Amino acid sequence: SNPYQRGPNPTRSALTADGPFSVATYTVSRLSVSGFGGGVIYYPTGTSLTFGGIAMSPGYTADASSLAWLGRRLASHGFVVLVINTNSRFDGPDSRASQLSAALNYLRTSSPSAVRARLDANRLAVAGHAMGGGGTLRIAEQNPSLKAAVPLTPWHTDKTFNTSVPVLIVGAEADTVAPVSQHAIPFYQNLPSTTPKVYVELCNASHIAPNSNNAAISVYTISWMKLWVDNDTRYRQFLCNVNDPALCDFRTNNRHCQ
Numbered sequence: 058s059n060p061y062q063r064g065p066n067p068t069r070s071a072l073t074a075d076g077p078f079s080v081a082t083y084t085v086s087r088l089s090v091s092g093f094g095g096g097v098i099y100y101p102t103g104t105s106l107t108f109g110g111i112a113m114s115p116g117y118t119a120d121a122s123s124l125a126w127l128g129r130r131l132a133s134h135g136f137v138v139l140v141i142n143t144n145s146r147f148d149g150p151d152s153r154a155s156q157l158s159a160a161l162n163y164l165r166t167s168s169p170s171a172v173r174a175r176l177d178a179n180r181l182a183v184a185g186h187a188m189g190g191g192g193t194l195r196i197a198e199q200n201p202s203l204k205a206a207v208p209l210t211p212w213h214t215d216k217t218f219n220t221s222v223p224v225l226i227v228g229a230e231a232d233t234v235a236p237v238s239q240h241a242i243p244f245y246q247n248l249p250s251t252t253p254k255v256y257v258e259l260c261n262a263s264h265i266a267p268n269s270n271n272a273a274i275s276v277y278t279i280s281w282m283k284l285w286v287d288n289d290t291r292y293r294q295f296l297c298n299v300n301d302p303a304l305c306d307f308r309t310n311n312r313h314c315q
């Protein structure tokens with residue numbers, strides 16, 4: 058009955074590996090686009106179906122390769138994922154938000170036929186690492202049509218975002234670049250009490266946890282994107298009544314479980 062529902066009923070262990078879809082990549086050259094530095098699109102193959110879109114920003118001095126594992130992971134569970142490069146390696150979080158805005162518009166309007174055919178441009182979300190997570194929160198405030206936002210070990214000088222876009226923030230306990238007490242947790246706490254929000258804190262994790270295969274980041278990011286981009290209530294099970302020994306903190310207003 059849910060026309061956006063993709064793939065078989067999920068199990069926890071299936072969400073810690075690549076999923077039911079084959080994946081192709083498309084390189085968006087820097088010279089071919091304005092408003093962002095290009096990037097890599099991960100999109101499903103072996104399918105005639107359409108999927109939601111995710112634009113994802115790396116952090117300060119990083120490029121799209123720093124989130125390649127998660128682009129491919131997400132695409133393999135049924136998403137079109139554009140991991141950007143930034144115009145400059147030194148772009149701040151609000152510049153990253155602007156480049157996510159350009160990436161979303163690029164996905165909708167000028168992505169190649171191969172990607173457009175797999176994309177439902179009505180269902181878009183954002184995610185990002187560190188300053189890219191900051192950009193994720195800013196664009197969530199500016200664009201109320203986004204289905205979800207997943208800031209990963211996010212960094213921003215702005216601690217206050219006004220959005221109703223559902224937010225799941227991943228903090229890293231041992232993060233020395235974007236300490237959770239100064240970044241992730243203030244972001245979580247200052248989001249509106251009426252916006253569905255989750256904070257998960259990875260035990261023992263560093264700022265670079267998001268840059269390689271991470272079972273917790275995989276489960277929470279797939280689950281949040283499924284729940285909100287696809288309206289796939291089958292993923293509530295991983296986001297609700299959570300007892301996860303990989304986590305050393307969890308905070309929610311439990312507006313996503315019913």
Ligand SMILES: [Ca+2]
Pocket residue numbers: 215216217218
């Ligand atoms: Ca603010």
